[PDB]
Write an enzyme that holds these catalytic residues in place. Structure first.
Site, short mmCIF file in Angstrom:
data_model
loop_
_atom_site.label_atom_id
_atom_site.label_comp_id
_atom_site.label_asym_id
_atom_site.label_seq_id
_atom_site.Cartn_x
_atom_site.Cartn_y
_atom_site.Cartn_z
N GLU B 357 41.08 -37.60 9.54
CA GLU B 357 42.52 -37.50 9.77
C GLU B 357 42.89 -37.99 11.17
O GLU B 357 43.90 -38.69 11.35
CB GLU B 357 42.96 -36.05 9.57
CG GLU B 357 42.60 -35.48 8.19
CD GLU B 357 43.53 -35.93 7.08
OE1 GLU B 357 44.65 -36.38 7.38
OE2 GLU B 357 43.13 -35.81 5.89
N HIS B 487 48.49 -38.71 -10.83
CA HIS B 487 48.88 -40.03 -10.36
C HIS B 487 49.59 -40.87 -11.42
O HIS B 487 50.22 -41.87 -11.07
CB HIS B 487 47.63 -40.78 -9.88
CG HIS B 487 47.01 -40.19 -8.65
ND1 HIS B 487 45.89 -39.38 -8.71
CD2 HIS B 487 47.35 -40.27 -7.35
CE1 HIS B 487 45.57 -39.00 -7.48
NE2 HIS B 487 46.44 -39.53 -6.64
#
Ligand SMILES: *[C@@H]1O[C@H](CO)[C@@H](O[C@@H]2O[C@H](CO)[C@@H](O[C@@H]3O[C@H](CO)[C@@H](O)[C@H](O)[C@@H]3O)[C@H](O)[C@H]2NC(C)=O)[C@H](O)[C@H]1NC(C)=O
Ligand SMILES: *[C@@H]1O[C@H](CO)[C@@H](O[C@@H]2O[C@H](CO)[C@@H](O)[C@H](O)[C@H]2NC(C)=O)[C@H](O)[C@H]1NC(C)=O
Ligand SMILES: *[C@@H]1O[C@H](CO)[C@@H](O)[C@H](O)[C@H]1NC(C)=O
Ligand SMILES: *[C@@H]1O[C@H](CO)[C@@H](O)[C@H](O)[C@H]1NC(C)=O
Lengths: 194, 592
Positions: B357, B487
Site C-alpha cells: 500500500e 466484479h
C-alpha cells in the site's frame, strides 16, 4: 532615527491575496537586517542584488514592502527569471531585482478546516504582467472570438480563482506568507538607514 | 486563437477546479470511512454529487473541442480522457434504466443469503459465512449445497437483469463510438501518438491469448498436482484424467486456489517462515511496520512519507472510539495529502500489505507534478503491479533477516522454497486462467457471438476447455453463474488481474537485473539498489502522460507483455511439478 518596525509588515492580522499584493513604504526610519535573520523562523530569506549583510548599517532609497500569501510550490515563482503563473499574472519581480524575499509557513493561521478559500490568485490573463504591476480586475477572460457579455461560458472563463488551504494539505499546497523588500538604489536622497 | 490555445485554457481551468473538488470529495469520504455516521454518509454523498456534476458538464464542454485539431499529444490525451461521458449519450430514461438495473444486481449480490437444504435456521449470507464454508470445509455435500445455493437463488434472479444489461451497455458503447461494451473496456489499454508504442484495442485480445498459450503448460502441471492431491481427499468424485468439480476449488467461484494448500502442501511437515510471532516478541507496533517500510523505500531511492502521511493517516483500529471500514486502502486526496487506511495488526501479512500500500502511495507521490488528468497509473494494472513487487521483495528471507525479524544464520531448504512457490502459484497461476476465461466470455457475449440460448452452455464449455473445471450439477440457461462474481454483477472489468500479474514479474526481473542480483528471481531484494529505484521512478513520474508501452520500455526494456519473467520466477516449482507428475496425466478431457 527611529527603528522601522517591520512588525506591522511581517506580523499582521491578515495578509492579502497575491492578486492584491500589498505595498508599504518604509521611509523616515532606521531598519537592520541581521536582526531579521535573527528573527529566524523564515523558510526562505533570499536577497537579490546586494551583499548578504554589507547593507546592515547602510542607507538606500524608498524601501517598499510587498506582502502576499501564496503556496509553497509557488515560492520559487517569486524571483528574477521565473516563468510560472504567479509570476506572469499575479506578481513579477524584475530581472535586475535589488531587494529581498522572505517567506514562512502560515499553515497555523491562514488555514482552517472546511478550507480557507479567502485567498485568491489570478489564473488567466490576456498578457503577462510587468515588473511590480498589479491587476485587481474581475472581468471574464474572453478566450475566443465570441464575446462573453460578462457571463461564464465556452471559451469564457472567470479570471480570479480561489485558494484551498486546509491543514491536511501537503507543504506544496500549504499557505506560505511572503514579504518582498524593494531596495531601489541610486544617487537620490535616502531616508531608510540601519 | 487556435483551437489548441482555447483547449489549453479550458484544461488549465478544469484542473484548477477539478483538483479542489476532488480534494473536498476525498476528505469527506475519509470522514465517512474513518468515522461512520449517518451525517458523514450524507456529506460524502453531497460532495460526490458535486464532483459528478463537474465531470459531467466539463465532459460535454470538452467534446465541443475537436481532438483531431489538437496536435500536442499530452494535451490531446487529457482532452480525450475528459471526452468520455458514456451514460450521457443514452436517453436519460435509459441512463436511469441501467442505473436501476446495476443497483438491483448489486443489491441482490449484497442481500443474497442461502439457507441449508435442511435446517431452516441455517440461512447464512454470502460473505459472512458461505465464503468461510467454501474456503475451509472438506465435505462434498456441504460445499455442493452452498455452491448450488448461490448460483441458483442469487444467479437465476440476475439472469434477466444481465440479459437487458448487455443490451443497454452495448448501446452506450455504440453511442460512444465503440463496437461493443467490450471494446469500451479494452480501450483502457489503448494508446497512440508514437512510433509503434501506440497500442490498438483488439491487439489486447491478440496479446492476452499469445501469452496465455505460453502459460498453459505451467497451469496444466499445476492442475495435475492439484487434481491428484484433491483426489486423495475426495476420491469418490475426482477422475484422474478429467476436470475438477468447481465446489472444490477453495472459493465460491474457483478464482483463487489458495485455500487448497493444506490439501496440496508439498512436504507438509517443513514449516513456512512466519515472522508474526517474532514481531510480537520484538514488541513491534503499527508505526514500526510502516517505518520499516519507509526505510525500505528510502534505501531504493524514493523519498520518505510526508509528515502529513504520519500525522493524518489511520494505521490502527480507532480503538472502540469509532466505527470504521477495515479494508486496506491507499489514498491520494490530491493537494499533497497522501494517506493510508489500514486496521494494521502485528502479522507478517499486514507487514507485506503495508509495503504494497505504501508502494501505491509512492507511485502517487511520484506523479503529482503531472496535471490532474494525467495523474494516474500508466494503465489499469501498473498501480497494483508496483505494490505487489514491493511485497514480493519484502517476503524474501533476506529482507526479513535485515530488519531483524529472522535469525541471522537462517537458511532456506528446497522443501520450504517449494512450499512457498506452490502457495504463490495457487494464488497467482491459478487465477490467471480463470481470469482469461471470464473476460473472454464477456467480450464475446457483448460482441454478440454467444446467443443467450447457449449463454451458460458455452460458459461451462469454456471452463472445461480453459480452466479445466466442470459443473458439479448441470445448469440450464435459467442459471447465470457468471454473475455470481462481485466484479461481474457490479459491472467491473476483470482483465486487470491478468495484466497486473504479467507485468509485475517483468518489472521485478528488470529491477533485479539492475541490482546485479544473481540466482532465483524468487530470492531477489531491490533494497539499497539506488539504480533500481531510479529506473522505477523514471517510469512512475510519467503517470499516464506517456504511452503505457513507453513506461514499460523505460523499465523492462520491451514494448509489450511477456511471460518469460513469470516463468523464470516459478521455474524451480515448474520442474518439481513436472517430476511429481511423471507417473500421472497432464491435461484434461474437455467433455470428460
Ligand atoms: C541495506 O543497508 C542496511 C544498512 O546497512 C542493511 O540493514 C542492516 O543494517 C545494520 C546496521 O544498521 C547492519 O549491521 C550492523 O551494523 C551495526 C552498525 O555498525 C553494527 O553494530 C552491527 O555489528 C552490524 O554490523 C546490517 O548488516 C544490515 N543488513 C545487511 C547489510 O544485510 C540492509 O540489510 C541492506 N539491504 C539489504 C538487502 O541487505
Ligand atoms: C464522527 O461522527 C460524530 C457524529 O457525527 C462526530 O461528533 C461531533 O461532535 C462534535 C462535538 O461534540 C459536534 O460539534 C459535531 O457536530 C459532531 N459531528 C459533526 C459531523 O459535526 C465526530 O466528531 C466524528 N468524528 C470523530 C473522529 O469522532
Ligand atoms: C514582528 O515581526 C518581526 C519581524 O522580524 C519579528 O522579529 C518580531 O518578533 C515580531 N513581533 C512579534 C511576533 O510580536
Ligand atoms: C527522509 O529522507 C531525507 C532525504 O534522504 C533524509 O535527509 C531524512 O533523514 C529522512 N528522514 C529521516 C527521519 O531520517
Amino acid at each position: 532615527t527611529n527603528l522601522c518596525p517591520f512588525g506591522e509588515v511581517f506580523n499582521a492580522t491578515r495578509f492579502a491575496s497575491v492578486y492584491a499584493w500589498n505595498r508599504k513604504r518604509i521611509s523616515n526610519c532606521v531598519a537592520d537586517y541581521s536582526v531579521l535573520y535573527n528573527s529566524a523562523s523564515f523558510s526562505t530569506f533570499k536577497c537579490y542584488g546586494v551583499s548578504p549583510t554589507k547593507l546592515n548599517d547602510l542607507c538606500f532609497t524608498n524601501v517598499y514592502a510587498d506582502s502576499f500569501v501564496i503556496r509553497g510550490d509557488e515560492v520559487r515563482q517569486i524571483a528574477p527569471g521565473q516563468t510560472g503563473k504567479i509570476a506572469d499574472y499575479n506578481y513579477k519581480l524584475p530581472d535586475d531585482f535589488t531587494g529581498c524575499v522572505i517567506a514562512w509557513n502560515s499553515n497555523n493561521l491562514d488555514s482552517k478546516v472546511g478550507g480557507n478559500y479567502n485567498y485568491l490568485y489570478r489564473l488567466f490573463r490576456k498578457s503577462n504582467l510587468k515588473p511590480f504591476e498589479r491587476d485587481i480586475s474581475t472581468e471574464i477572460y474572453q478566450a475566443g472570438s465570441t464575446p462573453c457579455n460578462g457571463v461564464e461560458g465556452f471559451n469564457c472563463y472567470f479570471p480570479l480563482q480561489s485558494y484551498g488551504f486546509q491543514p491536511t494539505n501537503g507543504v506544496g499546497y500549504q499557505p506560505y506568507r511572503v514579504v518582498v523588500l524593494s531596495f531601489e538604489l541610486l544617487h537620490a536622497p535616502a531616508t531608510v538607514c540601519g | 486563437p487556435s483551437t489548441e490555445d482555447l483547449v489549453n485554457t479550458f484544461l488549465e481551468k478544469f484542473n484548477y477546479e477539478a483538483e479542489e473538488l476532488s480534494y473536498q470529495s476525498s476528505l469527506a469520504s475519509w470522514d465517512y470511512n474513518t468515522n461512520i455516521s449517518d451525517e458523514n454518509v450524507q456529506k460524502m454523498n453531497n460532495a460526490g454529487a458535486k464532483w459528478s456534476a463537474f465531470y459531467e458538464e466539463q465532459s460535454k464542454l470538452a467534446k465541443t473541442y475537436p481532438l483531431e485539431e489538437i496536435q500536442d499529444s499530452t494535451v490531446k490525451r487529457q482532452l480525450r480522457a475528459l471526452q468520455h461521458s458514456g451514460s450521457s449519450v443514452l436517453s436519460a430514461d435509459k441512463n436511469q434504466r441501467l442505473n436501476t438495473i446495476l443497483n438491483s444486481m448489486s443489491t441482490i449480490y449484497s442481500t443474497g443469503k442461502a439457507c441449508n437444504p435442511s435446517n431452516p435456521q441455517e440461512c447464512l449470507l454470502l460473505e459472512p459465512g458461505l465464503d468461510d464454508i467454501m474456503e475451509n470445509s472438506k465435505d462434498y455435500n456441504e460445499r455442493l449445497w452452498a455452491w448450488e445455493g448461490w448460483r441458483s437463488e442469487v444467479g437465476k434472479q440476475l439472469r434477466p437483469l444481465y440479459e437487458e444489461y448487455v443490451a443497454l451497455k452495448n448501446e452506450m458503447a455504440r453511442a460512444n463510438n465503440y463496437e461493443d461494451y467490450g471494446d469500451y473496456w479494452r480501450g483502457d489499454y489503448e494508446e497512440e501518438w508514437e512510433n509503434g508504442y501506440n497500442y490498438s484495442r483488439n491487439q489486447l485480445i491478440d496479446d492476452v491469448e499469445h501469452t496465455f498459450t505460453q502459460i498453459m503448460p505451467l497451469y496444466q502441471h499445476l492442475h495435475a498436482y492439484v487434481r491428484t492431491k484433491l483426489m486423495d481427499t475426495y476420491p469418490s468424485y475426482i477422475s484422474p484424467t478429467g476436470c475438477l468439480p468447481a465446489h472444490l476449488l477453495g472459493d465460491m467461484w474457483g478464482r483463487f486456489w489458495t485455500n487448497l494448500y493444506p490439501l496440496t502442501v508439498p512436504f507438509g511437515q517443513k514449516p513456512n517462515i512466519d515472522v508474526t510471532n517474532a514481531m510480537v516478541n520484538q514488541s513491534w507496533d503499527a508505526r514500526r511496520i510502516f517505518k520499516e517500510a519507509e526505510k525500505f523505500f528510502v534505501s531504493v531511492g524514493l523519498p520518505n512519507m510526508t509528515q502529513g502521511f504520519w500525522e493524518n493517516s489511520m494505521l490502527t483500529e480507532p480503538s472502540d472510539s469509532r466505527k470504521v471500514v477495515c479494508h486496506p486502502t491507499a489514498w491520494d486526496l490530491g493537494k499533497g495529502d497522501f494517506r493510508i487506511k489500514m486496521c494494521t495488526k502485528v502479522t507478517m501479512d499486514d507487514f507485506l500489505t503495508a509495503h504494497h500500500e505504501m508502494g501505491h502511495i509512492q507511485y502517487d507521490m511520484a506523479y503529482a507534478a503531472q496535471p490532474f488528468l494525467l495523474r494516474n497509473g500508466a494503465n489499469e494494472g501498473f498501480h497494483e503491479a508496483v505494490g505487489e513487487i514491493m511485497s514480493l521483495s519484502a517476503a524474501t528471507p533476506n529482507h526479513l533477516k535485515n530488519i531483524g525479524l529472522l535469525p541471522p544464520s537462517f537458511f532456506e531448504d528446497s522443501e520450504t522454497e517449494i512450499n512457498f512457490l506452490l502457495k504463490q502459484a495457487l494464488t497467482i497461476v491459478g487465477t490467471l486462467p480463470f481470469t482469461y476465461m471470464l473476460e473472454k466470455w464477456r467480450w464475446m457475449v457483448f460482441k454478440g457471438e454467444i446467443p443467450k440460448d447457449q449463454w451458460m452452455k458455452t460458459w461451462w464449455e469454456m471452463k472445461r476447455n480453459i480452466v479445466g473445471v466442470v459443473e458439479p450439477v448441470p445448469h440450464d440457461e435459467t442459471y447465470c453463474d457468471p454473475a455470481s462474481l462481485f466484479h461481474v454483477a457490479n459491472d467491473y472489468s476483470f482483465i486487470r488481474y491478468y495484466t497486473r500479474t504479467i507485468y509485475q514479474f517483468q518489472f521485478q526481473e528488470a529491477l533485479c537485473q539492475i541490482a546485479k542480483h544473481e540466482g532465483p528471481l524468487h530470492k531477489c531484494d531491490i533494497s539499497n539498489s539506488s539504480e533500481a529505484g531510479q529506473k522505477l521512478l523514471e517510469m512512475l513520474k510519467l503517470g499516464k502522460s506517456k504511452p503505457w508501452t513507453y513506461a514499460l520500455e523505460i523499465v523492462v526494456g520491451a514494448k509489450n507483455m511477456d511471460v518469460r519473467p513469470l516463468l523464470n520466477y516459478f521455474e524451480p516449482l515448474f520442474t518439481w511439478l513436472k517430476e511429481q507428475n511423471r507417473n500421472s496425466f497432464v491435461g484434461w478431457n474437455t467433455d470428460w
